[PDB]
Design a protein around this nucleic acid. Structure first.
Ligand SMILES: [Ca+2]
Ligand SMILES: [Ca+2]
Ligand SMILES: [Ca+2]
Ligand SMILES: [Ca+2]
Lengths: 219, 211
DNA sequence: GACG
DNA sequence: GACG
């Protein structure tokens, strides 16, 4: 049975940040890739890496963080507080929320955000970020799900579950453009398309309200 | 230097229900915003995109059906966009576009291929029906066709293949061709910037495609 | 042209 | 572990 009905659109979501949870990191890059459920509802071996649906909305943004990028974040992601400021990137701010709001508003409701390790990373982090704003959270009315739980579940029914490992186990290919918000969100879409009807249903079953996610750290 | 140095280039691409004759409406819109400073052999390797870009890509339900030609080459149709729940070109889109523009240093200059004859007049027509003040007012625009001529057929693909001695990909998706456009524009970035600064014109002076 |  |  379904806790909240059928999610009308899935939003694959990926972030880059200044470091790992222990460093109370900040967002530096954010990608959203909105897909309607019909899009998710395969010939050959190894299985062709699936084409993205023809109809998707994509938002990819760069974000000046209020603190330095740890050296680790800098070398994996290719970003730095200093370069984003050279390119005049604005921070995680009220206008970024209206933007998110308007972007989310264009999607059939309700939404379900899907991030890889989202339960331990992107969600709580996004939650922390948004809590600083005075604009109402534009996420409070969405649902979320962590695609590590999904892939486990799905593979089980037919080992490492990091992004690339799964993508490589599934497709016998290397993921491209790793650690760019968009780059890795696409690879995430690829593995979620592995069994669309099965993932799509696993999502409906496990979706939970974003507002019940705890912030990574406090103010 | 009529309008100072553009701080942001926003490469712009659309899909639509057809060609100007048919009074088209927009079905797909893609914006690729690159800061000025992320723009400052043989055959030349296709250039890479800068690490820092902002991208917005949206499918839009048109009010009129697609012409058979527009469906053919774009893979889109009113019915599909609708059944998949795409909203119209509405006030919220205007609010979204604007929020996106607000994140860039000014002045922004739009860049589109044959934009003076297509995209710009088309967008202006779409935006004139809205109660929101246009988010594009105060922006600048330029036609990458004039740009590429001045720098050197001038179809998008012709140019790409002529500069990089190889084939484009992902045609007639708003994003597919916006990326292509990005490449040929970075063939000679510095020369491009200088020409853009020189020929940029206020979007708000662009006549509507139709009324 | 050259844009869909 | 897995997220940067
Ligand atoms: Ca991630
Ligand atoms: Ca990543
Ligand atoms: Ca075009
Ligand atoms: Ca196109």
């Amino acid at each position: 049975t379904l806790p909240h009905g059928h999610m009308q659109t899935l939003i694959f979501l990926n972030l880059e940040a200044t470091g790992l949870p222990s460093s109370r990191p900040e967002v530096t890059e954010l990608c959203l890739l909105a897909v309607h459920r019909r899009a998710l509802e395969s010939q050959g071996h190894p299985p062709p890496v699936p084409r993205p649906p023809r109809v998707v909305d994509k938002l990819s943004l760069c974000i000046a963080p209020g603190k330095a990028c740890s050296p680790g974040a800098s070398e994996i992601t290719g970003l730095s507080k200093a370069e984003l400021e050279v390119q005049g990137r604005q921070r995680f701010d009220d206008n970024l929320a209206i933007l998110l709001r308007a972007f989310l508003q264009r999607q059939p409701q309700p939404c379900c955000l899907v991030a890889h390790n989202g339960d331990r990373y992107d969600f709580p982090l996004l939650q922390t970020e948004l809590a600083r704003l005075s604009t109402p959270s534009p996420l409070d009315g969405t649902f979320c799900v962590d695609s590590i739980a999904a892939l486990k579940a799905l593979e089980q029914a037919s080992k490492s579950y990091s992004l690339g490992s799964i993508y490589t186990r599934l497709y016998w290919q290397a993921p491209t453009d790793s650690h760019t918000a968009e780059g890795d969100v696409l690879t995430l879409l690829s593995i979620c398309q592995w069994k669309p009807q099965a993932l799509l249903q696993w999502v409906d079953e496990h979706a939970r309200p974003f507002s019940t996610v705890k912030p990574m750290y406090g103010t």
